[PDB]
């Protein structure tokens, strides 16, 4: 299970963690948003040592802007308040390799 955010504060809080946080940022009205649902869940399914969070821009658009996510679906990895990876497309293997790389 990938944990749900509530506000940009939640996003930022997960960001400030001294560990790999990969955020599943998509929109419920978007097409391939449903690819980020299981693919990203599958990431921490392998390595739960990383932080799994997700949020819909449909619900929180100002949050999207806070994170620099306009495209969807988007994956944002951060460490300790700074980025580590920015992706705008579910890439099953390459992004699982990403999360592990930035971790």
Swiss-Prot record:
Stored InterPro entries: Thioredoxin, Thioredoxin-like_sf, Thioredoxin_CS, Thioredoxin_domain
Molecular function GO terms recorded: disulfide oxidoreductase activity; protein-disulfide reductase activity
Topology with respect to the bilayer: Peripheral membrane protein
CDD domains: TRX_family
Location of cross-link Glycyl lysine isopeptide (Lys-Gly) (interchain with G-Cter in ubiquitin): 54, 66, 96
Nucleotidyltransferase as UniProt keyword: no
Pfam family, one: Thioredoxin
Cell compartments where the protein resides: Nucleus; Cytoplasm; Golgi apparatus membrane; Mitochondrion intermembrane space
Disulfide bonds: 30-33
Keyword annotations: Cytoplasm, Deoxyribonucleotide synthesis, Disulfide bond, Electron transport, Golgi apparatus, Isopeptide bond, Membrane, Mitochondrion, Nucleus, Protein transport, Redox-active center, Transport, Ubl conjugation
Active site: 30, 33
Residues of the site described as Contributes to redox potential value: 31-32
Modifications after synthesis and translation: Reversible disulfide bond formation between Cys-30 and Cys-33, reverted by thioredoxin reductase TRR1 using NADPH as hydrogen donor.
Coiled-coil region list: none
Signal peptide interval: none
Superkingdom classification of source: Eukaryota
Additional facts recorded: Present with 8579 molecules/cell in log phase SD medium.
NCBIfam families: thioredoxin
Family: Belongs to the thioredoxin family.
Protein name as catalogued: Thioredoxin-1
Organism name: Saccharomyces cerevisiae (strain ATCC 204508 / S288c)
Chain's gene name: TRX1
